[PDB]
Amino acid sequence: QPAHLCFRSFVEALKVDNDLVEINTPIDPNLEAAAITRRVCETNDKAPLFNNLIGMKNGLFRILGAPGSLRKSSADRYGRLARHLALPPTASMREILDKMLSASDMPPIPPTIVPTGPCKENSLDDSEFDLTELPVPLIHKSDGGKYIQTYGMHIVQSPDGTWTNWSIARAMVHDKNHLTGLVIPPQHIWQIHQMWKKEGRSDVPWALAFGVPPAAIMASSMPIPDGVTEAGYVGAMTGSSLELVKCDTNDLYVPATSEIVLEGTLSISETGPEGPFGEMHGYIFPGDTHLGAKYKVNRITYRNNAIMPMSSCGRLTDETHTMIGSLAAAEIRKLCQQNDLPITDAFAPFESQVTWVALRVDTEKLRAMKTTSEGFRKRVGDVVFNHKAGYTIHRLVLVGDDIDVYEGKDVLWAFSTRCRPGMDETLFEDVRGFPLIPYMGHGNGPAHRGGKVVSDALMPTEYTTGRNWEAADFNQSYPEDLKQKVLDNWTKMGFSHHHH
Amino acid sequence: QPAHLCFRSFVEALKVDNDLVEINTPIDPNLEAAAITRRVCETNDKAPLFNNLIGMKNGLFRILGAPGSLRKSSADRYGRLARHLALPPTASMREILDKMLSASDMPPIPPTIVPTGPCKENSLDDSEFDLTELPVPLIHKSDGGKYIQTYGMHIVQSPDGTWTNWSIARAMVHDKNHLTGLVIPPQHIWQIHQMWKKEGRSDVPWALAFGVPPAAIMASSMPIPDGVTEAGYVGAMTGSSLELVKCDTNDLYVPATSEIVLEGTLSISETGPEGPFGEMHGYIFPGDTHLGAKYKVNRITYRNNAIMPMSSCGRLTDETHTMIGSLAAAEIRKLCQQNDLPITDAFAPFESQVTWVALRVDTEKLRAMKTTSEGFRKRVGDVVFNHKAGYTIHRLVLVGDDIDVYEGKDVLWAFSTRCRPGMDETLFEDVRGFPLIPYMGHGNGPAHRGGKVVSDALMPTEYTTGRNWEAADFNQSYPEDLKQKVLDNWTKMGFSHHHH
Numbered sequence A, B: 001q002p003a004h005l006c007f008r009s010f011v012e013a014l015k016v017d018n019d020l021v022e023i024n025t026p027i028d029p030n031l032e033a034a035a036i037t038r039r040v041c042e043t044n045d046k047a048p049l050f051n052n053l054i055g056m057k058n059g060l061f062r063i064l065g066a067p068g069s070l071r072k073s074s075a076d077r078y079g080r081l082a083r084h085l086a087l088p089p090t091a092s093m094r095e096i097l098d099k100m101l102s103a104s105d106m107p108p109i110p111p112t113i114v115p116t117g118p119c120k121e122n123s124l125d126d127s128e129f130d131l132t133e134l135p136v137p138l139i140h141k142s143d144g145g146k147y148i149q150t151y152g153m154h155i156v157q158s159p160d161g162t163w164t165n166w167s168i169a170r171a172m173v174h175d176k177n178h179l180t181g182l183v184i185p186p187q188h189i190w191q192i193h194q195m196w197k198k199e200g201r202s203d204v205p206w207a208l209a210f211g212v213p214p215a216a217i218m219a220s221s222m223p224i225p226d227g228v229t230e231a232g233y234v235g236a237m238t239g240s241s242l243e244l245v246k247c248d249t250n251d252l253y254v255p256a257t258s259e260i261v262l263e264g265t266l267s268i269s270e271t272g273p274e275g276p277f278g279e280m281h282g283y284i285f286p287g288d289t290h291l292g293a294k295y296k297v298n299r300i301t302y303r304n305n306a307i308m309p310m311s312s313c314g315r316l317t318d319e320t321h322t323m324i325g326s327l328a329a330a331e332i333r334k335l336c337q338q339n340d341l342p343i344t345d346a347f348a349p350f351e352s353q354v355t356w357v358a359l360r361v362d363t364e365k366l367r368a369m370k371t372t373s374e375g376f377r378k379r380v381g382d383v384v385f386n387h388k389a390g391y392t393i394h395r396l397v398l399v400g401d402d403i404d405v406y407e408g409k410d411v412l413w414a415f416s417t418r419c420r421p422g423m424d425e426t427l428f429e430d431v432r433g434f435p436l437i438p439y440m441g442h443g444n445g446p447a448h449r450g451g452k453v454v455s456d457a458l459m460p461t462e463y464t465t466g467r468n469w470e471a472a473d474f475n476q477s478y479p480e481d482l483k484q485k486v487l488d489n490w491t492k493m494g495f496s497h498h499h500h
């Protein structure tokens, strides 16, 4: 099966790429696996596959860390993401995000039901598993629980059957047969949950599939529109209907090649202690436990030699930066274009801990609008910050056509030199805020509201007559023939490879 | 003579360090020298010494580019700056800035007059030179003139004789015997100029010395206090009285080992076209010429085989970042401490194009103040932004004791995650602004006023009871013994030198 359609094939792809280290000696899921993974993520090393996890019983489970993290070289920096999508490993960010957006104007390709698959190789019923006995990792030393769920896909369906959502929300083990986790607005698992609670008749039928098709985990992490079933979007994106099998204890459908599947219910009434957890923005607040959603597990099914993917998230760079930030930015780029805003590209700079999105503007189009900074900043912020795709983003930086928004250094340069603090900015206090950012949920103001800003790094003449400067750089402040002479004589004179 | 006290010895030091490329074939001062230098600065290469400059006559002149730019390795990144100051080449930024501040609580060591020196090896009077005939560089393709002065020291003295200031302000050739340049408030050359214009009797006696003692060019680029003679400060800093010779046509004194010396006057009445110039913030605005100050040159003296230093300034990283930013930040650190503010360290991040300064706070001291963010932000901004040392800085970022302000990545992390836009910031509109930043002089508001902000990246509990988080990083979210186990087994398991 292809790597983008089968997690087990994706692991083999990473090996073939010389992008995997298989650790076959005993590794402790209490911190050690996540510590190795953390170091990998902070150094852009090869992904670790822990084949000998202390506490692994009857096939549950091996761990793959850092599945969507960065490689060291510039030439295949995003290779692990490209391997989720059948793209060449040298794919640019622009090409990855375009591939993630491509299904947005295609008909869905709904999934195909098959009668069985590898996820049915083993099962454990209600008397045979205990979630406290599995090798679930403690990921950070102060975490409030063992976070079994950092890279699986929650599957829930609207009561009317019309929308089936796939999404990554965190969850940790509560006891032998329950998990707790975050289920918060405006996320789709929350939106569906609310539908079931207003009906008031039963808990939400639920499954959580780990080690799903890599193309499906990518869509699970992208804020595609309300009401859209991720399976059909992935089908369109990949040009192939995904094969799903039915759960044994409910009528939801899971990828046939899922490594591990939990089946059960998400309660519409119960809660339990959840968190704290070491989070995307680089922090944990020890002892900051709050009630979260409560899931009951009725059944586990799994592949022989099952592998659990894990995100050891925190400071730069991991799946929470490469996937949450970049995929939000892709959806925001589309959203702006559909609102007739002249945006060509969008990216969430890593240097902003993916809290900013830089929006590249077609300034020829801007000029024809015959508008001003104040008006244009307000229009952009109202579109993005009132939409779910803007949830996690607190600062939008508008830049002209000379800036490559996928290059943090150039975004930082533009922001720092072209946006006058205050005067060139519009603050938004009456929009939903992202409470996980420290300055929101542990800050001086309301955890759930405001704290957002549009910073205009467009220069004045970019609204009127056109760019009126040249950069004081080697590229722009010397003629072509001189530049080429310099480069051709560089090593000859005494001064100092693309792949490496 | 030691390298920090003699420019010619400093060039030899850079060679011995394998930090120099001597180019002995013909190089054009029309762009080519500055293009090579620009590339050096954008790639942290070795400093270029152009020994065969097309148009060099009767010893005037060779060029050294990139004299205060960065080296490639992390271990001696600031080595070229250390070589200005007799510090080991591995010196940290903290050690360089401490050495620049050390004279601030020492008695001055005034200079020693000697009867001659190498700067008197050759002379040209009023009938023998023509500044349009020398190999003065065109540094950027759209510059409004040939900028002879990018790394020399202007010397002017108060009418009462009590203060002699040394400073770098840019100047370009106007005609055979004049230069034009920037003389703008609040700079000391401007402050002295104003004194002479209010007396109204004569133009300002003036000299411009190129290739001065490296310790003296550093102090020339630092905003030490009003009224303080840079020579005595350098004397104290170095522990040695500087040797100066008298000018031939005026009574000012120049370093004895200066490579080239211009003697003349700065007019109290005349102006001439000046600029545009490719500037520190990374831009040139072609055709943006304005009247600047006008200098008359009456005499040139120079060393045999004289060498002119040159800054090919613009985008990262050159002398305008490493010296203007860092030395302002050092003076701001001192200024805050003298105003009883609990600041331990200050640095202007390169990523902010040296427009921000990050101030590290002793949060134990902050806690004893029993204050709030709003009050503390106002107090810090009022101290810094009303002082000359704050002129070039438009954003101050306050951070707690965990952040290394000399590490841009950590400053960016703190800013982006701990400062809530708007609410955690105070804007300052009634302070002097730096017009050279594009968003000031080519922006939407007053070029000379406002546009400044204090951004508080201190978390709430840092004012009260103490830090209440741990970072979600390898350093902080795993115990010591585990971390060390991981590191000791890293290459054994399969994963990947300080000098490289």
Ligand SMILES: Cc1cc2c3c(c1C)C(C)(C)CC=[N+]3c1c([nH]c(=O)[nH]c1=O)N2C[C@H](O)[C@H](O)[C@H](O)COP(=O)(O)O
Residues within 6 Å of the ligand: A149, A150, A151, A165, A166, A167, A168, A169, A170, A171, A182, A184, A186, A187, A188, A189, A220, A221, A222, A223, A224, A311, A313, A319, A320, A323, A324
């Ligand atoms: C890649 C990624 C995405 C996480 C995520 C992480 C990763 C690695 C974890 C598991 C490591 C940390 C926690 N995560 C949560 C999360 N969304 C959320 O609501 N709660 C979370 O707890 N997301 C973000 C979420 O998946 C996106 O917002 C999706 O758009 C949700 O899909 P939806 O649009 O269908 O609601």
Ligand SMILES: Cc1cc2c3c(c1C)C(C)(C)CC=[N+]3c1c([nH]c(=O)[nH]c1=O)N2C[C@H](O)[C@H](O)[C@H](O)COP(=O)(O)O
Residues within 6 Å of the ligand: B149, B150, B151, B165, B166, B167, B168, B169, B170, B171, B182, B184, B186, B187, B188, B189, B220, B221, B222, B223, B224, B311, B313, B319, B320, B323, B324
């Ligand atoms: C390192 C450095 C400093 C420049 C400088 C450059 C460099 C490389 C140039 C020459 C390449 C670009 C232009 N420069 C100017 C300048 N100050 C100024 O007022 N006008 C300028 O034109 N300075 C900043 C100035 O030297 C500091 O502000 C000093 O504090 C001035 O000394 P003072 O405190 O005694 O007035």
Ligand SMILES: [K+]
Residues within 6 Å of the ligand: A166, A167, A219, A220, A221, A222, A223, A224, A230
């Ligand atoms: K999704």
Ligand SMILES: [K+]
Residues within 6 Å of the ligand: A418, A419, A420, A424, A456, A457, A458, A459, A460, B439
């Ligand atoms: K602007």
Ligand SMILES: [K+]
Residues within 6 Å of the ligand: B166, B167, B219, B220, B221, B222, B223, B224, B230
């Ligand atoms: K000075």
Ligand SMILES: [K+]
Residues within 6 Å of the ligand: A439, B418, B419, B420, B424, B456, B457, B458, B459, B460
């Ligand atoms: K704050």
Ligand SMILES: [Mn+2]
Residues within 6 Å of the ligand: A165, A166, A167, A188, A223, A224, A225, A228, A230
């Ligand atoms: Mn969805």
Ligand SMILES: [Mn+2]
Residues within 6 Å of the ligand: B165, B166, B167, B188, B223, B224, B225, B228, B230
């Ligand atoms: Mn001075």
